Amino acid sequence: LGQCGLLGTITGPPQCDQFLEFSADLIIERREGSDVCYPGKFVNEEALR
């Protein structure tokens, strides 16, 4: 997911656009993965991740 953050794949921020409907047996997320573009967070987000 590179610069995408794994909770953005259901929101689609402007770096997750190549990723909105993926299909994988191995998801990979990076330190620079920002889940959002507009600043904020998901509530109860570790259950969601």
Partner: protein, 148 residues
């Protein structure tokens, strides 16, 4: 292991056949039970980029450390038996050789202290080919081994 004879003909370090490779045979068995099979998949309960909550994070760290202390404790007990499980095979061959050598030559020995039998009759190379491969006649040479 080994076989060794020596005479007025020569000197030789040979092998004595009926167990000599068999130091593979329980030695092949230890290792895949030991290098065992792991099949349980473990998920991602905590996040290394940003901050699970402190109380459960303490419980997770306490549970992981507790689990860590269990698996690490279990780690160092598995090894100590395998060192023991190697000594016996030298022992169970040592008596095996000891129990073999006193049976094929009946009234033809006194027991040594060095692991060496003193053959109570004349023995050249054709006689060396009798006890080594289980073709010795311990009825035929006993009239002359009693006088020696």
């Amino acid at each position: 292991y080994g076989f060794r004879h020596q005479n007025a003909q020569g000197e030789g370090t040979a092998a004595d056949y009926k167990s000599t490779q068999s130091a593979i045979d329980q030695i092949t068995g230890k290792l895949n039970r030991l290098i065992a099979k792991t099949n349980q998949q473990f998920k991602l309960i905590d996040n290394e980029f940003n901050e699970v909550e402190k109380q459960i994070g303490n419980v997770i760290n306490w549970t992981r450390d507790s689990i860590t202390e269990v698996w690490s404790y279990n780690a160092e007990l598995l090894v100590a038996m395998e060192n023991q499980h190697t000594i016996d095979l030298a022992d169970s061959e040592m008596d095996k050789l000891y129990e073999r050598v006193k049976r094929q030559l009946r009234e033809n020995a006194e027991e040594d202290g060095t692991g060496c039998f003193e053959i109570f009759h004349k023995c050249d190379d054709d006689c060396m080919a009798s006890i080594r491969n289980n073709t010795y006649d311990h009825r035929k040479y006993r009239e002359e081994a009693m006088q020696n």
